[PDB]
């Protein structure tokens, strides 16, 4: 029931996100979108780690983007429309009705949770995020992690090169 509610909320916020001209409307819409996407991703995995990781990522990213909102397109008009509110309300109540009259066994995800796994699975009895995150630090794929460290260092070098700090601060009509 909660998964179908998250489906309906993600659909309604995606309709809202496709229709917003103002960057702050897009920012708040993608705030509630990443909240609902973080909860939905959690439902699929045995543990709740990557939802938390994705939330730290997408709250570390738009924290910067608001500073660029206040530095570029700080002055732009909001335009509320009754058509979008009526459309979102009608679609939202229609999908809550459709989710209430639906069989929730057929609409549930086939991905296995921590309790959907059987009792005979001895790997399920370990600590909940151990075997999932193991291959980041194991022998076949530590070199991809090495490549990611060097990639992030090269990324930082690129950011320093193409954002020249000695040219001055950035604003509109600089």
């Amino acid at each position: 029931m909660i998964q179908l509610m998250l489906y309906s909320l993600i659909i309604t916020t995606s309709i809202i996100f496709l229709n917003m001209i103002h960057p702050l409307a897009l920012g708040l819409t993608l705030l509630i979108q990443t909240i609902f996407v973080c909860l939905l991703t959690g439902l699929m995995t045995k543990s709740f780690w990557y939802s938390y990781i994705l939330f730290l990522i997408f709250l570390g990213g738009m924290l910067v983007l608001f500073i660029y909102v206040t530095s570029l397109a700080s002055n732009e008009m909001f335009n509320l429309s009754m058509k979008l509110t009526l459309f979102s309300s009608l679609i939202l109540i229609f999908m809550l009705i459709l989710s209430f009259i639906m069989d929730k066994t057929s609409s549930s995800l086939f991905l296995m949770n921590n309790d959907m796994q059987s009792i005979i699975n001895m790997n399920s009895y370990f600590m909940e995020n151990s075997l999932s995150l193991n291959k980041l630090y194991n022998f076949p794929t530590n070199f991809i992690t090495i490549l990611l460290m060097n990639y992030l260092l090269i990324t930082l070098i690129v950011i320093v090169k193409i954002t020249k700090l000695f040219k001055g601060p950035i604003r509109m009509m600089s």
């Binding site: 921590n114 309790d115 009792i119 399920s124 009895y125 909940e128």
Partner: protein
């Protein structure tokens, strides 16, 4: 002089001690066990499923009186 700081501090000490100790009563009123079952590990959750399968109360314990005489 300086002891008047202690009114206004003990209230922070007492009231924040409220939501733990009250549950140490409020479980014992209805659960019967002061500690409700922790669900951190998968095995504790599976054995909680076993207890709630055996009895409607998972905190009611089946002792040796359940076992038939043979």
């Amino acid at each position: 002089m300086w002891f008047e700081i202690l009114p206004g501090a003990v209230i922070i000490t007492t009231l924040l001690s409220v939501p733990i100790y009250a549950m140490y009563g409020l479980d014992k009123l209805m659960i019967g066990n002061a500690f409700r079952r922790n669900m951190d590990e998968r095995f504790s959750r599976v054995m909680y499923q076993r207890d709630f399968r055996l009895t409607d109360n998972p905190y009611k314990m089946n002792g040796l009186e359940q076992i038939p005489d043979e």
